[PDB]
């Protein structure tokens, strides 16, 4: 299952 | 043995028209199990192994939602990076991201990782401790300071040590008949006369899983690398792998040479010798 | 910033003339990801070729598998033709059944 809270640059 | 779950993401900008190409792939060990391609018709995360097909609609809706969120992050990141490197709008550029987790033999968390690249070079990566970042240059250094103040590593660490491992264990169980099976290499040797006075012996390893393998030649019981060739491990297309190693020897001296095969699926390494 | 592809052309199974098999062209070690890969039968592009989803290695270089069903014979020549920004002309690697 993918990570739910990827941060942008 | 030990196991990993990994996700790989690639976005390529398309200046002439429209949005970046985005491709995401998920693996357990050396088995692809999911994909997303922005060019494909479904616009969903899709199954690529039988054992993931049993997951229900909630799963596929959530993975689709998350993967689209990843896609949009990569789209804005391409723009941010173009600005950081003072590049024009005219050229195509690439972001790559990989993350995931390893468990050891006893299924406990072993390692996590999260790495990001721009135009095929390191940009920023989480350190092994999952607590701080390795920034390759001053652009990435500004990313690091921002992500530090926003506690980005902490939230990623919680995923990597927790839910990543939990899902990995779930997939290993659901896919056990293949994911927890080793396929030992099927091995043989061929012989070809290269001139009047020399021959090539080629040691084959076929139909193995996982991909990791070592092939080595010995002469008179000592390792030999001169006059050898070792091809890179390649997929057969059916989920298994292939490799070979060859040595050139004086004709008539074939019996001095042995091929040694090491693989997780072998209780003991194999030794092959030319016997016809 | 540019890395040229490595190419291997091979069958899935040990080849026997007249028996159905799969012809593979494995391209790896390249950057950037845009690449053109065709499989050829006697010089001509094979239409029903598929490929793996783009992925990459530790060094960030890309790899792809291109493949098609085929039935080898004594006389039919197979090859893989690759074009990439690092190549001034398309590169043709011939299938050799002992490799």
Residue numbers in the entry:
A (entry chain C): 1 to 9
B (entry chain A): 1 to 276
C (entry chain B): 1 to 99
Q: What do the study authors state?
A:
The majority of these studies have focussed on the immunodominant response through the p17 HIV Gag-derived epitope SL9 (amino acids 77–85, sequence SLYNTVATL) (6–23). Instead, in the face of SL9-specific CTL pressure, HIV has been observed to undergo preferred mutation at positions 3, 6, and 8 in the epitope. Here we use structure and protein biophysics to deconstruct how HIV escapes from the well-studied SL9-specific 868 TCR. We add to the existing data by providing the first ever TCR–pMHC structures in this exemplar model of how HIV evades engagement by host TCRs.
However, based on previously solved structures [A2–SLYNTVATL, A2–SLFNTVATL, A2–SLANTVATL, A2–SLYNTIATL, A2–SLYLTVATL, A2–SLYNVVATL, A2–ALYNTAAAL, and A2–SLFNTIAVL (21)], some of which we replicated in this study, we show that A2–SLYNTVATL, A2–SLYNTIATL, and A2–SLFNTIAVL all adopt a similar structure to every unbound SL9 peptide variant, apart from A2–SLFNTVATL, when ligated to the 868 TCR. Furthermore, these data do not support the notion that HIV escape is mediated by dynamic differences in ligand engagement during TCR binding to SL9 variants. Similar experiments, performed by examining the relative binding of 868 TCR to A2–peptide by SPR over a time course at 37°C, showed that both A2–SLYNTVATL and A2–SLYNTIATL had a half-life of >7 h. Since A2–SLYNTVATL does not change upon TCR binding, we can now be confident that the conformation adopted by this, and many other SL9 variants, dominates during TCR recognition.
